[model samples]
Target: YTSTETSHIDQESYNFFEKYARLANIGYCVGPGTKIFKPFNCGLQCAHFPNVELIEEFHDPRLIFDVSGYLAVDHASKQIYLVIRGTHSLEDVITDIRIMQAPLTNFDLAAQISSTATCDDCLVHNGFIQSYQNTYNQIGPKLDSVIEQYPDYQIAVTGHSLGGAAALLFGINLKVNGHDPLVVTLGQPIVGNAGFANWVDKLFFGQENPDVSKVSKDRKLYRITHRGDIVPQVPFWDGYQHCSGEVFIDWPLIHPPLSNVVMCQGQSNKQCSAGNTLLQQVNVIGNHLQYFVTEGVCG
Candidate 1:
């Protein structure tokens, strides 16, 4: 995590990221402008992932999974910045989870089957537990390494979608481990049930500073959403009100407001009134995924 070590690995990691960006059709330019650092044994393809060799060497299974993004540690400033992409499902989160959990569990099972279940019923109980376990495994040690490398550093975690859930879990875990990290998520959905979500908010944000207005001046956890994104409002309603975070609804500017928006039309009985003046001005596709690649606003 030292700057010297980071510098040495920069080129190699950037090479991997460049390859991934191409294959994933991420449509982002990668070069010296962006500092992409890959951890040892990080996989570039799915085939290389769940790497037994890496797990054997590090005694940490989380290192085996593909790290699709970058971790930039500013040793001089004592700050660690992590930009992670969202995961697709609980199974996606558990891939690396079960690997690390291998040492903790006695059973030997196929990674695919071990992470899969029958229905939503399973997702609520066994599925969520597995997700939490995997998330903890993946993030816990990384945070430790960041802290060990820069004992005085403050940490910031950011992600969109699945990566957002991981960020939330990661921030909470960091706080529980006695290090407080600031987390900001874009269009993050409710990761777990109401109870678990509440526990995370209270533990990190504090009970008194529940909402954004009351959030502690020193810490910030913000969730930004588009009006019709359907992600921010899904699964939880009043439960998220207490977090010391701000939710900014990005109203789109398209004519007819919600026109051309995915899943925004006709699902609800209510519709945007004709000739409404207030509309989100950003292009849906460009703006929706902009946070993934660009460091600037979508306008």
Candidate 2:
């Protein structure tokens, strides 16, 4: 039952990450019996999410509904979320191409997502930008309208695997606008160059290892990975670095009911899990799926 700890973070808060992760993961589990949009499945025990309400669903139906996902509002938590399913269709794969394109010089990163807006010069993954735009362009106005009614609520964007990368860009877009929302990803791969990752770092941790006293659980970025998650290791190219603030889940393939879980202090912290040896690197494929491993019918 020994768990790792970080300052300024309540251990109980992790339940928040775990719950949202599964909600984001369930986005991929859309199938025969599962509902497409309204009230996407979530854990009943979740403090904030148990009472989550369905907002709307988004995807290009014209493309045969290939890249599909959902959005919901959590009244208990005062958070509105946009959740995308990971690679579930051919359309999703087509978008995951390792290509870097358009720079969304939209907002300047001056004030935090809550207040000031000046996300000056931040280059992001090309595929990610387009994928998010696909859904954002359509529901954006509606999303804004809803938020206006509930001005006190914050936005949260999350995904798993491919969805995680897209969520990074999606959340970054909101951040540039100075309306910071919490970004929580599970087993996400790095999507941009070193500079992009650095930008993510500064925004979340404020530096390499954030001052716990100041760090809050709002509109921040959290990359959660299992010890052997290989997905994040790859796309591992020149200048391709991961963002900091990794909440490493130390459970391995063969272990007890659970093992130690800890939050790494800074970017690329070896303590959590980053391929060190060839053997360990290859072993990562085992835990590619969620550790919560809710074997679903989606895929």
Candidate 3:
């Protein structure tokens, strides 16, 4: 697994993960000066790209997850990134309770973003879907503007925790809406069922799609997690399944220096969290708060 750098990961892809990780931590990097607004002191691994410009940041406390998200453009990378803040409000926690499975509708999901029950039949998390709906309700048109403005820049969507959950749907929304966006989630919970997972796999990781397959592993939609991070192991009682391509990072709890990371098969892989059972596998809740970081807010 230490050889991940050689066979599975690349420096550029790993750098993208670390960038989005810290960007996920900075939920409100919009409506400010040229310097990205960083409200947290924890992101030791992520830095604002030089000449990065704020596009828009919106936080609606009334909604679950608040859709407390922002969009930014990096002049150096010719990249546009949309980041959603994960689990920052009481309403967000409450929305997490509504884990019921629902159908994935379309016809105009990210298009209208308000009209639901029209897309595919894939089963998805009710709460995450709702928050994405609300998120698009507000940011959809503005995001449309960003898409229109930067028609050629790469679009990468990312988030942590609950925001990561929404990032799953949000990124997929972008995909179905005809944009090639890279979705990188940190400590994100499962957003849909096995069928939904298969749907996403077909879209991003089809067996015959070498173009997408050829894309560096970290450039695709990845649910990057720390060893024993509990967030990605959630909604078990509701039968949720994570999308493919898990990047498992291990930081020695009782030792020093992070282990070189590795890739894992589906969820609960013995190689993923090193436990025989699901509960035993997700033992490091503290690891859920910080990806590739040394510490968290209260840890």
Candidate 4:
């Protein structure tokens, strides 16, 4: 049907979908300086952002993981954004495969970060945690130096796929560092165990086991999963679980009708992607590759 029939979904979530999706997609472009402000060259996805100031462009010094992204100030939105790019090469896939579960306390960010929610038993994927740290190491100093200049601005973190997994960790780091970060990840894999998920719910939404009805308004994490996108389903262990704030796209393809985008109730709600039993039909190149727009391309 028509995209205007979005009455079925929360108006605010749909509004954010376009805004954050563009920011997430722009992560793919390598526009180091003034090039970022040029839409015609950077591509249409990076066009709408006006009067943007690039803080720092992150290129992981440690070439093993190949993590890359940028921190920028979107003067138009009064937002300081940390955008992480998704997997583009073999090195990124290597990070994805390093799925060993490690205690969250072992990491500097998780250890130093203060939150209302506490989980001593929390554990996260080893690779994702390392990638998050690599990205933060590059952008962290710039964010520290720039915050005083834009005290009124809020923080927004976003990414796609593997980048999404890292974005969640980065958001958590930013949150405990005394900034409120709005995190939106696309087709993100399960990042941690149930204990970690519970901790994340409390840290972001100030509740344990938060559901769609309770989280629609004033939220932090928005984990968007496209129809049967198998990436979010990986590291398929019983202990591994997804965090709350899952917006599942019901339509089968890109640019899904707004009404079909459902804010699912509760973590890993079976009615959404968790319910899709189409392993034989799963097409990562199609479903996983496309979110609200085509990703990883520059003009």
lDDT tens digits by residue: candidate 4, 142-168: 887777888999888998877788889
lDDT of 4 at 11: 60
Q: Each prediction's Cα lDDT score? A: 0.37, 0.58, 0.61, 0.70
Which is superior by TM-score, 2 or 3? 3
Judge candidate 3 at residue 64 and give its lDDT. 53
Candidate 2 per-residue lDDT over residues 190-224, each given as its tens digit? 66665566667777656644532223545387777
TM-score of every prediction relative to native = 0.49, 0.74, 0.76, 0.85
Which ten-residue region of model 4 has the weakest summed lDDT? 1-10
Candidate 1: residue pairs that collide? 86-163, 87-162, 210-242, 251-280, 252-279, 252-280, 253-279, 253-280, 253-281
What candidate 1 gets wrong by more than 4 Å, as runs, is: 1-67, 75-77, 87-139, 214-216, 236-244, 253-287, 290-299
lDDT of 1 by residue, 223-268 (tens): 5344444443333333222232433322443121222222111111
The candidate with the higher lDDT, 1 or 4, is 4
Candidate 2: worst-modelled 10 consecutive residues by lDDT? 106-115
Candidate 2: residue 147 lDDT (0-100): 79
Model 2 misplaced stretches (Cα beyond 4 Å): 1-10, 31-33, 36-49, 61-66, 87-121, 208-219, 253-259, 276-286, 293-299
Best by TM-score: 4
Clashes of each: 9, 12, 5, 0
User: Considering TM-score, which of the candidate structures 1 and 3 is the better prediction for this target?
Assistant: 3
lDDT for model 1 comes to 0.37
